[PDB]
């Protein structure tokens, strides 16, 4: 799977409120990655690189996390 195809998969999730809510239910980045793997699995997308944590491990926003706490928490949005 190409990086463009991966981006298309990401878009599908971003444009699906139901899947967004699922990602909001997840807390850590690892949990987020696990979820989108499940999404890819059900839909039939190649999540090899995702499983390897090469893609979809961080936001595209340039804004950096300013949180001081190093504890895990439920994702907002």
Automatic annotation (TrEMBL):
Checking InterPro entries in the record gives: CHP03798_Ocin, Nif11
Q: Which Pfam families match?
A: Nif11
Q: Which residues form the Nif11 domain?
A: 1-52
Protein name (Swiss-Prot/TrEMBL)? Nif11 domain-containing protein
Q: Which organism is it from?
A: Moorena producens PAL-8-15-08-1
């Amino acid at each position: 799977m190409s990086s463009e195809q991966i981006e298309q998969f990401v878009e599908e999730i971003q444009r699906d409120p139901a899947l967004k809510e699922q990602l909001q239910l997840q807390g850590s980045i690892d949990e987020t990655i696990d979820k989108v793997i499940e999404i890819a699995k059900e839909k039939g997308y190649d999540f090899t690189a995702t499983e390897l944590k090469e893609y979809m491990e961080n936001p595209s926003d340039e804004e950096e996390e300013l949180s001081d706490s190093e504890l895990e928490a439920v994702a907002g949005g």
